[PDB]
Amino acid sequence: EKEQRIANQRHQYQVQQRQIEKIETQMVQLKSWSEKAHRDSTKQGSASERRQ
RNA sequence: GCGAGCUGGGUUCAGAACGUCGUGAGACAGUUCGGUCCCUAUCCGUCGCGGGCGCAGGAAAUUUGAGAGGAGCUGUCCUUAG
C-alpha cells in the first residue's frame, strides 16, 4: 500500500508541475509579444502613415 | 498647402472567416471579404457687374500714364564644315 501511495503522490505532483510549466510558457510567449508590440508601435507603415 | 472644393481605395465601428494565442469571453505577435463623407455663405478674402457722390459751372468726345497685371519655355534639321 505504501508503494501505491507514493506512486499516486508522485503522479499527482507531476501533473501539477506540468500545469505550472504550461502557464509559464504561455506567460513567456505573451511577454515577448508585448515587448515586440510596444517596440513596433512606432515603426509601421510608410513615413506619412507613421505620422498619422 | 488644398475634404463648409471632390474622391474614400488604405487604415481603426458594428458582420464573417483563416493562421496563431487563450480554459474562456475574446485577442494580435498576422491576414481576408463586406461596410451611411452632413451644411441654403452673415463677415473678411477672391472673380465679375452695377448704383451714389466726389474731382469749385453744366455737358459730349479723345487721351497722358503714377501705378497694376500678362507674357517670359525649348527640341530637331540644314549651313558654316566633315
Ligand SMILES: [K+]
Ligand atoms: K486553442
Ligand SMILES: [Mg+2]
Ligand atoms: Mg501589430
Ligand SMILES: [Mg+2]
Ligand atoms: Mg478647407
Ligand SMILES: [Mg+2]
Ligand atoms: Mg475605404
Ligand SMILES: [Mg+2]
Ligand atoms: Mg470677419
